[PDB]
């Protein structure tokens, strides 16, 4: 059932990124780059996948999305490009 899903509008969760989302995304990109995924950024000799991940997050070039689970099972669907990673 899709009715629980919220559309791109009427989302009430914070666009400002949470530290836990930041940590999970850096880790997930870190697995992807460590296991031969394509790298979305020009590499200036960087070799640590975590550093490559931080660089991509800095440029908002991470192809990842978050279902932001409302506790009733519904979710808000938030893209990393639009998620304001201020901190």
């Amino acid at each position: 059932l899709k009715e629980k899903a919220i559309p791109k509008d009427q989302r009430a969760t914070t666009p400002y990124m949470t530290k836990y989302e930041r940590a999970r995304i850096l880790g997930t990109r870190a697995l992807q780059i460590s296991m031969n995924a394509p790298v979305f950024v020009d590499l200036e000799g960087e070799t640590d996948p975590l550093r490559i991940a931080m660089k991509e997050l800095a440029e908002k070039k991470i192809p990842l999305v978050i279902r932001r689970y409302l506790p009733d099972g519904s979710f808000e669907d938030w893209s990393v490009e639009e998620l304001i990673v201020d901190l």
């Binding site: 780059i33 460590s34 296991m35 590499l43 960087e46 070799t47 996948p49």
Partner: protein
Amino acid sequence: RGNLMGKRVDFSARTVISGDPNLELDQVGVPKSIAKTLTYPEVVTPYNIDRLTQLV
């Protein structure tokens, strides 16, 4: 309580602690022996192939 809430695990060490003002706040000194035993599984990429081949 003894095997699920808290349990055992590898990839770990225990030893004495000494003060060290010549170490950064978020840094911790590890004995050479403890480093020799403990390992991190690192996957082979083009970006660390040379260093990993040297380590092997």
